[PDB]
Amino acid sequence: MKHLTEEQKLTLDMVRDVATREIAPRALELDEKSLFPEYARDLFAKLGLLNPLLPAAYGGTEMGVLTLALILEELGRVCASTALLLIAQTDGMLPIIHGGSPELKERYLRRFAGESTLLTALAATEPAAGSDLLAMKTRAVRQGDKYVINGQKCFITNGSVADVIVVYAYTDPEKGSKGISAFVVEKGTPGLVYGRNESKMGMRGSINSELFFENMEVPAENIIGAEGTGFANLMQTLSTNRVFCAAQAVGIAQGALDIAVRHTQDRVQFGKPIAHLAPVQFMVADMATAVEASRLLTRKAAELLDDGDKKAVLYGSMAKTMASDTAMRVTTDAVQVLGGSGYMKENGVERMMRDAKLTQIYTGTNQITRMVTGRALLFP
Amino acid sequence: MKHLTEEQKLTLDMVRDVATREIAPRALELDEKSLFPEYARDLFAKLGLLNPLLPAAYGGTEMGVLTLALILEELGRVCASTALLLIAQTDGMLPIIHGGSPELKERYLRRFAGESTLLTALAATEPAAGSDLLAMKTRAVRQGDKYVINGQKCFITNGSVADVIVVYAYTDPEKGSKGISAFVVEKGTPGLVYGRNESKMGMRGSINSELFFENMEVPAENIIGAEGTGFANLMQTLSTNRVFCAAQAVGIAQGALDIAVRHTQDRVQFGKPIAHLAPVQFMVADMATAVEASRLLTRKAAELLDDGDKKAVLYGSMAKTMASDTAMRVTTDAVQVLGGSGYMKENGVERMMRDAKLTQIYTGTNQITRMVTGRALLFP
Amino acid sequence: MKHLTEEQKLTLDMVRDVATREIAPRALELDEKSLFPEYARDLFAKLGLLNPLLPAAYGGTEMGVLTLALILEELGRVCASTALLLIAQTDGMLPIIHGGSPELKERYLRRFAGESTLLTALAATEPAAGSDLLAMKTRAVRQGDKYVINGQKCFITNGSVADVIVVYAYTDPEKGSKGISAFVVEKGTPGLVYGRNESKMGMRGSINSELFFENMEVPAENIIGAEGTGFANLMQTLSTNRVFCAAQAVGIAQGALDIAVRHTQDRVQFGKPIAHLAPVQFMVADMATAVEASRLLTRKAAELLDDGDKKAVLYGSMAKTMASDTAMRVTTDAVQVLGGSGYMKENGVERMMRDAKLTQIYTGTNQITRMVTGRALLFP
Amino acid sequence: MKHLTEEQKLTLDMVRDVATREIAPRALELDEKSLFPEYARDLFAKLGLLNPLLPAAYGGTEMGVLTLALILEELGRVCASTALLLIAQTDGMLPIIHGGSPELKERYLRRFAGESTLLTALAATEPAAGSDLLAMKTRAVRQGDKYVINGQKCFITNGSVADVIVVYAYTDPEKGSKGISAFVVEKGTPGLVYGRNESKMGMRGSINSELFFENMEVPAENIIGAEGTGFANLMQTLSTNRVFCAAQAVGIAQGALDIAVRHTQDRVQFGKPIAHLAPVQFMVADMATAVEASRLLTRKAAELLDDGDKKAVLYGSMAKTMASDTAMRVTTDAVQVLGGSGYMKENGVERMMRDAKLTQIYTGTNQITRMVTGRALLFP
Ligand SMILES: CC(C)(COP(=O)(O)OP(=O)(O)OC[C@H]1O[C@@H](n2cnc3c(N)ncnc32)[C@H](O)[C@@H]1OP(=O)(O)O)[C@@H](O)C(=O)NCCC(=O)NCCSC(=O)C1=CCCC=C1
Ligand SMILES: CC(C)(COP(=O)(O)OP(=O)(O)OC[C@H]1O[C@@H](n2cnc3c(N)ncnc32)[C@H](O)[C@@H]1OP(=O)(O)O)[C@@H](O)C(=O)NCCC(=O)NCCSC(=O)C1=CCCC=C1
Ligand SMILES: CC(C)(COP(=O)(O)OP(=O)(O)OC[C@H]1O[C@@H](n2cnc3c(N)ncnc32)[C@H](O)[C@@H]1OP(=O)(O)O)[C@@H](O)C(=O)NCCC(=O)NCCSC(=O)C1=CCCC=C1
Ligand SMILES: CC(C)(COP(=O)(O)OP(=O)(O)OC[C@H]1O[C@@H](n2cnc3c(N)ncnc32)[C@H](O)[C@@H]1OP(=O)(O)O)[C@@H](O)C(=O)NCCC(=O)NCCSC(=O)C1=CCCC=C1
Ligand SMILES: Cc1cc2nc3c(=O)[nH]c(=O)nc-3n(C[C@H](O)[C@H](O)[C@H](O)COP(=O)(O)OP(=O)(O)OC[C@H]3O[C@@H](n4cnc5c(N)ncnc54)[C@H](O)[C@@H]3O)c2cc1C
Ligand SMILES: Cc1cc2nc3c(=O)[nH]c(=O)nc-3n(C[C@H](O)[C@H](O)[C@H](O)COP(=O)(O)OP(=O)(O)OC[C@H]3O[C@@H](n4cnc5c(N)ncnc54)[C@H](O)[C@@H]3O)c2cc1C
Ligand SMILES: Cc1cc2nc3c(=O)[nH]c(=O)nc-3n(C[C@H](O)[C@H](O)[C@H](O)COP(=O)(O)OP(=O)(O)OC[C@H]3O[C@@H](n4cnc5c(N)ncnc54)[C@H](O)[C@@H]3O)c2cc1C
Ligand SMILES: Cc1cc2nc3c(=O)[nH]c(=O)nc-3n(C[C@H](O)[C@H](O)[C@H](O)COP(=O)(O)OP(=O)(O)OC[C@H]3O[C@@H](n4cnc5c(N)ncnc54)[C@H](O)[C@@H]3O)c2cc1C
What we know:
By secondary structure, the first copy, chain A, is an alpha+beta fold. Chain A has helices spanning 6-23, 27-32, 38-47, 65-76, 80-97, 102-109, 230-266, 278-307, 312-337, 339-342, 349-359, 366-378; strands at residues 120-123, 139-143, 146-157, 164-170, 180-186, 192-197, 208-219, 223-224, 268-269, 272-273.
């Protein structure tokens, strides 16, 4: 657990303050009415929190993965949707940060400098290509000084609102994991078409888009890296995304635990607070221990990523699986601890349980993350 | 597993047909728009399915608990809310059926004969008295030929719409489990006041009421049984309710499993249906086995109830805990099996997961049911 | 749950009596000193319990699978090793009963009539061929009126002591699942060689043999069924074996539960029996519920087998997985309930935990049984 | 995860070397023949490893709790019994180190300086007083310049061989948690009587003693701290013991995992190493993740102890519960991964499963540790 710099400590104190005073009171309505977290996005921009991994060279704060992880745990505590904003925003920029040419980085990252409110998105998933990302069908054909892109993407977080989308497509279908390339695609490009914004079980304070590319021309200079390196770029981006999912899950689990704990102190049955009942003590014990274990695995994984350590793949996969499992279990149980009240929309913990489910599925499902982990352990 | 009579087999074939053709297509909208299942209630009345435990002597079909259990499994498969209608309807009548005088039974059960569409409710729970039902505060004072009732109830299923409500109240607070009595209270009684219909995580195709009794007079002849027998009447009603909860949970789990199974056969990743993947096979195996185990425990418990066998308490408690746990786990996993699509409202399995949670809480939580089970095993 | 005949009820009362009075007092020593259960084998022969599935036509009692299952639950309660005797004995005869010609059945089953004490064994597993039984290397070559058998088997229960062993071997390696045949091999055949009797974690009141076949000649008329039908014969025998494993596991779990229950009533800490502590009540609840669920799944599977119902494969696989898992969990927890004393050899429950582990592995491991179950559900 | 000093790094490299080259080859025989680990005890003394928490002031290395934890993880990897030697040795000295007067510390700790091979033991548990330590019956009566001790202890690790035993007894039964005192008792004191060395499921390379005190006189100056402070001294010693149990459990789990991993790489079924099978990958993933999570919780708890941080109680309780649970699960599964071979004594992983069970029970059971954890979270 690296010593935090004073800059990190100040950032995290401010995040905890904003989470408590501004984010938490909004979260019920954000879910109830399925709202993009505009107020949060605007506030985060003003405070320097929207783009924490943007490099200093492009006007960013370049905080590192550990810092963003800690931020995600604080936000996930109170609003999983508001955390997801930060995950999608950082995700959409990471392919350019780590693959783009000097020229491309300057061209497209400058607009995110400072208090910019512009948004990113990452578009890899397709109806045909979820866990099997190599099955994606979107194609990019070189024609002169342009690529012509045809296909579709689904479940794209912020897709319909992103200024800049990183699209993965095949430039050579025959070469498989060596035939995918990655492209910067700007909002307003002719041929970019938005589909439905789908209705979800949870994390409803969000945008979940279908994209279509119909003879969509992008300049040749919008390619990220060389042709055929896009699958490795995607896999590297996912390695980091998984740690962000894990951090958000740690937060979700903690926020539900905190509400369970307070309920046990306040709710009297059989003549005393229910905290006095040994089975409630046992439930809270098991909940807190899994959150703490998940927190430690997640912080180790984030540190390994910042250090550029090969082991980050393994530990990030174990942190994603364990912290999401833990958020699913702990939230299920925190609803239980609140009894009837736990099932009521007004008390929040039902939303956190709906939110928790997504963390088992996105950034790759927990069956894929178990594959990645097992492969890394058995075929080192 | 008793041989089913031909009357039971015909009933269950008809229920399966109605569930498939009429109930299943309605369930998405029932949840989305938070609708009482009026069409179902009216159809069930016409078909003789609304009041299966009403005795023949009062114009009812007197099917028994095993039959209703099987019905609940079929309905829960497709619409947990529509099953809950039948649970609440039977629950609200069981205190009168098993405690009321000949005169009271005739007076209040006759109106449920035949194709009646009138509704019942059972009102025991209070803000102060959830697991600790002995902590209820509602009071009934004898004044002449009337009782004067003052207090409140919450989480009452169908409360605001029931023609007949069974209210539990203290007639002698000092005598504890011997000082509660039970009362028939009619819709339209001066002093009966409805509160909010609360918004729930799931089973939203339902009514969940707060009741208030403000100097509410009921005739002395509306008491169910003698003064002070109401706690035993309540405990007996819960013994049976628990088996109905278990049956509904079995159905929920089965309906989610069925959608998972079909998805594995249709969804191709890595070049074949995902059914070909051994981890998916393992998930479905574990899901199906827990549903089947829960189904068997539930059918044994229902049979013991019909037989009047003392062991029904023990087995019903084990069936409630195990079938609700199983619905929570199996639905959580069926969402998982559908991946991203599983999280989308349009595909149903997210609702079944929200519905499943309630089965762990109502009719007594799974911590209370474990207490009941453990007590029965250790202090036989 | 079929009504038991009076013959089955008498048999099971006698088994319960023998288990309690004769088997239970011997079990500690049987494990401690790694003893074949000779006294049990001899007593079972005298009482008509050694060979319950031997057909009447060959002097046997022809009890059926349900009866043997119930017997296995009673024996497993007190001595898993003594149950295993009955499993191995029946297993070794089932290939002949269900595959052998009239002539072969008369030739080799007659010697098991009545109070015979002769033993059987089933020899399929090899070092190269455990879960992958198609990888077996043992070969049988037709030479005139004989087959010449060369290879080896391991983990063969009773192998070195069986009068009659059913050996599976390839008669045509190129035909795979159609190139295995099955053979009766008699104790005393030149070329049959015994290896080590290996030392096990549990079920130590048993014999676990390595067999070698060195140019071992058997008469051509010792083949069971036609050449190449041996893999189907083996798979059918395993379908039934799995239900016997499940029954034994149910017994193991029950016997450990019973000792836990009694300990909670007798062991006083904090001034009362520990049965008074809600967490102990919860543990015992969860234990009893999983035993009961496993018991019901096992009895359904056995009935389907007796009825010749295709669904027996599916249900037997679910019963084996669930009842063995349950024995592993329940015994682990029954040791826990006894605290320090639970870890001591003198109190029995540590042996039942060591015994329980085997039930997850033999008759095919719980990963294979999950494959079988999942395949049956997804590819019906 | 504090940076390790170069002294800690050298110590741990040496421990890993000794564990691998000297401890691991001995462990099978140590269990098989129930041997005290004399060779290890003597080697550890020579290398400065027997008494790592002995203060420098008394000739000790004063390594701290973190160092001993890391040592325990290395030893537990290969021999749980040899780790337990170090746990018992440190435990028996900690009451004197942290409670004894200057005079008492010099009098009794000097003999453990340097390469001493003398042993300690901690004697609190009684037949009447396991989880309920306040129920202990042993009494110490002041008579002049002596205390007269009468009672008994059981499950005392190294009890019959310890030169110095710390005995807890009531000096004032009426004062409860303020009426227990702690005493140094020397081997050879008239009135100290040894009972049986009991036979255990696992950790059989150990001594597990019953002690009796029959009018046993000890000098008044052998009291540890003032009269009535012994319960707090005991509770503080247990807080630290729990972290040592957790560390040993982490090691047990790791050692079983390592053998599972190697087996998957070497064991071929279905034509490839079983590592290729996705279900095996999943099992190993879940195993490794729980070991890593337990490792992190344990290292955090040990650091908090070294830092004198109040939170050590909470984290040590969560580490003990989680690391022991994990050793029980991971070893159960590592036996599974080795299939039939996993059940055989020669392959080691069955012993580690038997060893693992104890870690759930000793230093306080996992039901008590859950109570401690839950209390700390709900009543901070
Ligand atoms: C693991 C997988 C199934 C690929 O496995 P397969 O069995 O098919 O393929 P394979 O044979 O193992 O590998 C092929 C080649 O890849 C290479 N390579 C591998 N790893 C590499 C690495 N780390 N780095 C570099 N390269 C790596 C290999 O070395 C190999 O190349 P080779 O033959 O030349 O050596 C992959 O498609 C996957 O991750 N799917 C999960 C879907 C998912 O994560 N979706 C999340 C979407 S976003 C989200 O949800 C959001 C949410 C919130 C808001 C923001 C977003
Ligand atoms: C178990 C409980 C905590 C009582 O335990 P406690 O520790 O406080 O009390 P105790 O000391 O054990 O017993 C006191 C006396 O009771 C008697 N007695 C006991 N059992 C009896 C029996 N079976 N039969 C007869 N009598 C029985 C005892 O013998 C004893 O009397 P004694 O001293 O003279 O001998 C109880 O309040 C409970 O069940 N709460 C759960 C709440 C719940 O279920 N709410 C569901 C609401 S509806 C719902 O949710 C819906 C959903 C869907 C739509 C429709 C509805
Ligand atoms: C499942 C298995 C892995 C075969 O799967 P694979 O993926 O390799 O092969 P596959 O492709 O699925 O099938 C090949 C062919 O088989 C046929 N067929 C399949 N099922 C059939 C059925 N039910 N009936 C008839 N036929 C059945 C198929 O239809 C197919 O033929 P096809 O292509 O012409 O259509 C198999 O080797 C197995 O069970 N291993 C577990 C080891 C085990 O149980 N050992 C226990 C040892 S004893 C013990 O431990 C003791 C303890 C106590 C004391 C006493 C003993
Ligand atoms: C938790 C327990 C049940 C006491 O709970 P109860 O509900 O009965 O009592 P309570 O009411 O909570 O507390 C009473 C008073 O205690 C005080 N106090 C509490 N904690 C304190 C602290 N940390 N520090 C200081 N003081 C602490 C309280 O503040 C309170 O005082 P107050 O009223 O004046 O304020 C206790 O007996 C226990 O730990 N049993 C487990 C047995 C066990 O661990 N055995 C392991 C044996 S060794 C082993 O196995 C080996 C293996 C390997 C080789 C080497 C060895
Ligand atoms: C709200 C939301 C936001 C998302 N945001 C992003 C985004 O911004 N950008 C983006 O590109 N994508 C995004 N994702 C997509 C997401 O990563 C995927 O849904 C996920 O990879 C699963 O793919 P799928 O939904 O096609 O499920 P499938 O791959 O069809 O999985 C179905 C089931 O099969 C199992 N399965 C599949 N393969 C295997 C295997 N080899 N072994 C064992 N089991 C397996 C899965 O675990 C699952 O249980 C998001 C999804 C959602 C729902
Ligand atoms: C939608 C809905 C419909 C319902 N329908 C009916 C109805 O029609 N009529 C009716 O009367 N009631 C109804 N119930 C009420 C229901 O049975 C209760 O909510 C349930 O008993 C729990 O009570 P509570 O919500 O007060 O939770 P609490 O009793 O406050 O429980 C809080 C937590 O403490 C735990 N806890 C409490 N006591 C113990 C104990 N002794 N040991 C261990 N843990 C314990 C609980 O398990 C829970 O985890 C319904 C509730 C809901 C939400
Ligand atoms: C005491 C004892 C008695 C026995 N009695 C009999 C007897 O009388 N006669 C007889 O013929 N045999 C007997 N068996 C053998 C027994 O059935 C096998 O050990 C069992 O099939 C496993 O084979 P294996 O030990 O080779 O393990 P492996 O097949 O090597 O398994 C190693 C691991 O790989 C996993 N694995 C293997 N294949 C797959 C797959 N396709 N998918 C997922 N995971 C998989 C397994 O589940 C296990 O976890 C007995 C074994 C024992 C130990
Ligand atoms: C091999 C071995 C070595 C040991 N070494 C030491 C040693 O060197 N010195 C020493 O003093 N002691 C030693 N211990 C003792 C050990 O700590 C105890 O056995 C342990 O505290 C449990 O006590 P018990 O065995 O009396 O079980 P009990 O306290 O009788 O427990 C029985 C069951 O009740 C449960 N239970 C008890 N109280 C509660 C509660 N309040 N809430 C919920 N559940 C509860 C327990 O968890 C357990 O499941 C050792 C024990 C063993 C077996």
